[PDB]
Amino acid sequence: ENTPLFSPSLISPDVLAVLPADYTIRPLCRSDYKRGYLDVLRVLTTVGDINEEQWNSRYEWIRARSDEYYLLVVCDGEGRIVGTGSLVVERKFIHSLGMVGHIEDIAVEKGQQGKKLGLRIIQALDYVAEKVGCYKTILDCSEANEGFYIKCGFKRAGLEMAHYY
Amino acid sequence: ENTPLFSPSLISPDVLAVLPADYTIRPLCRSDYKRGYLDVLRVLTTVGDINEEQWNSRYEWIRARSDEYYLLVVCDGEGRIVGTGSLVVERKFIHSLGMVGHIEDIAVEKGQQGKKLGLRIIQALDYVAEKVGCYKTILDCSEANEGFYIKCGFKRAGLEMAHYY
Ligand SMILES: CC(=O)SCCNC(=O)CCNC(=O)[C@H](O)C(C)(C)COP(=O)(O)OP(=O)(O)OC[C@H]1O[C@@H](n2cnc3c(N)ncnc32)[C@H](O)[C@@H]1OP(=O)(O)O
Ligand SMILES: CC(=O)SCCNC(=O)CCNC(=O)[C@H](O)C(C)(C)COP(=O)(O)OP(=O)(O)OC[C@H]1O[C@@H](n2cnc3c(N)ncnc32)[C@H](O)[C@@H]1OP(=O)(O)O
Numbered sequence: 048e049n050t051p052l053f054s055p056s057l058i059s060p061d062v063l064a065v066l067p068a069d070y071t072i073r074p075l076c077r078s079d080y081k082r083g084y085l086d087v088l089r090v091l092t093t094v095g096d097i098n099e100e101q102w103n104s105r106y107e108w109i110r111a112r113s114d115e116y117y118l119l120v121v122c123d124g125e126g127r128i129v130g131t132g133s134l135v136v137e138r139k140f141i142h143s144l145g146m147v148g149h150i151e152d153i154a155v156e157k158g159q160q161g162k163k164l165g166l167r168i169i170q171a172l173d174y175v176a177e178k179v180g181c182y183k184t185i186l187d188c189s190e191a192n193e194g195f196y197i198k199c200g201f202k203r204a205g206l207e208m209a210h211y212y
Numbered sequence: 213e214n215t216p217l218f219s220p221s222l223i224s225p226d227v228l229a230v231l232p233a234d235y236t237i238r239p240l241c242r243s244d245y246k247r248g249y250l251d252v253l254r255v256l257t258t259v260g261d262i263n264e265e266q267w268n269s270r271y272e273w274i275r276a277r278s279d280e281y282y283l284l285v286v287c288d289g290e291g292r293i294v295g296t297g298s299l300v301v302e303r304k305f306i307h308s309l310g311m312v313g314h315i316e317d318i319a320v321e322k323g324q325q326g327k328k329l330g331l332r333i334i335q336a337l338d339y340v341a342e343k344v345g346c347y348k349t350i351l352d353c354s355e356a357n358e359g360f361y362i363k364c365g366f367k368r369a370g371l372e373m374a375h376y377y
């Protein structure tokens with residue numbers, strides 16, 4: 048219930064060292080449902096209404112795949128979740144059975160934006176990806192937040208194409 | 213060993229109906245190592261040297277995750293693999309615990325290109341994604357093959373950003 052999703056050993060010590068006083072970054076755990084986690088994702092897009100049972104079910108699905116789904120949180124001095132980020136590690140046959148890190152669902156509470164918390168989330172996710180043996184990390188962004196990813200040391204590599212249902 | 217990776221029920225019947233005479237599309241199976249599968253991926257990028265033991269190991273990893281990794285093949289009239297495509301289904305908390313389909317590692321043998329086999333692979337992967345409940349399918353492409361994805365009914369949705377190790 049407070050068991051971290053993945054090893055705290057995968058949290059970048061350099062990131063931990065430069066966070067603001069009393070803020071932390073750490074793996075998700077199941078009790079994060081009760082520390083404002085889904086409210087943070089509302090800055091991204093529609094989350095929907097998810098009750099605790101549905102959370103517990105998806106959480107255990109993700110925990111059964113914790114060599115694939117690396118979800119971490121930023122907490123303020125009061126233990127409130129104020130930022131989220133995901134790394135999803137894709138297995139391939141190409142690149143000698145290579146692994147690609149996919150950065151997803153990056154979100155910082157509006158009142159907490161513009162203090163480098165997104166940068167720290169990206170640095171932490173890039174640390175995980177390198178540690179577990181990804182050959183690269185990629186993500187999709189908008190023209191409007193490309194400048195954020197540039198300041199995180201990402202470069203334009205191609206186009207995102209979509210098909211909706 | 214000839215057990216399909218996923219249910220043949222997930223292969224689009226409309227696609228099967230319009231393939232060229234004696235060509236088929238079907239799930240990967242483990243014995244596809246011996247029908248030229250990795251040679252097809254060489255059109256994409258470097259595959260490396262993978263022996264049968266390493267193949268069997270990754271195959272079983274993927275088969276243990278066949279609600280996530282949907283790999284399918286196009287076979288010619290002689291049972292040779294001439295095309296490949298992947299759908300990887302990502303689980304999210306957003307969009308009411310939504311699922312996004314990721315189209316990956318699309319490859320047609322050079323001598324078999326320009327006969328709609330890539331189109332059929334994309335149509336088949338989009339069929340899988342809709343069937344299992346994805347809210348969208350996305351992929352990354354180059355400026356040079358954007359025109360292919362446009363003819364498959366995809367639209368530009370954002371930018372692919374990359375960070376290498
Ligand atoms: C892959 C994905 O998840 S894309 C989805 C990204 N998420 C969103 O767009 C949701 C809403 N926005 C947010 O949640 C946040 O604003 C984020 C995640 C985009 C950025 O996090 P923040 O903590 O606000 O940014 P942070 O302070 O770390 O930014 C790092 C630097 O980039 C700058 N920056 C932040 N956003 C942008 C932007 N949209 N365009 C240009 N520069 C930006 C910051 O000013 C800062 O600059 P500095 O180094 O000159 O001070
Ligand atoms: C997400 C990813 O995997 S991106 C990686 C894609 N893979 C590669 O680029 C590897 C090398 N190329 C190939 O393997 C193949 O050429 C593919 C997969 C790109 C396309 O498959 P093909 O079977 O050659 O194409 P197919 O005949 O189905 O093409 C459908 C239509 O798009 C056209 N087309 C194909 N490639 C392109 C292109 N690069 N630019 C513009 N139009 C194209 C075809 O002429 C055809 O047009 P029509 O409907 O007017 O006849």
Ligand SMILES: Nc1cccc(-c2nnc[nH]2)c1Cl
Nearest residue numbers: 135136137149300301302314
């Ligand atoms: N492209 C992409 C983006 C986000 C997650 C994934 C994924 N990889 N494994 C499961 N999902 C993939 Cl393939």
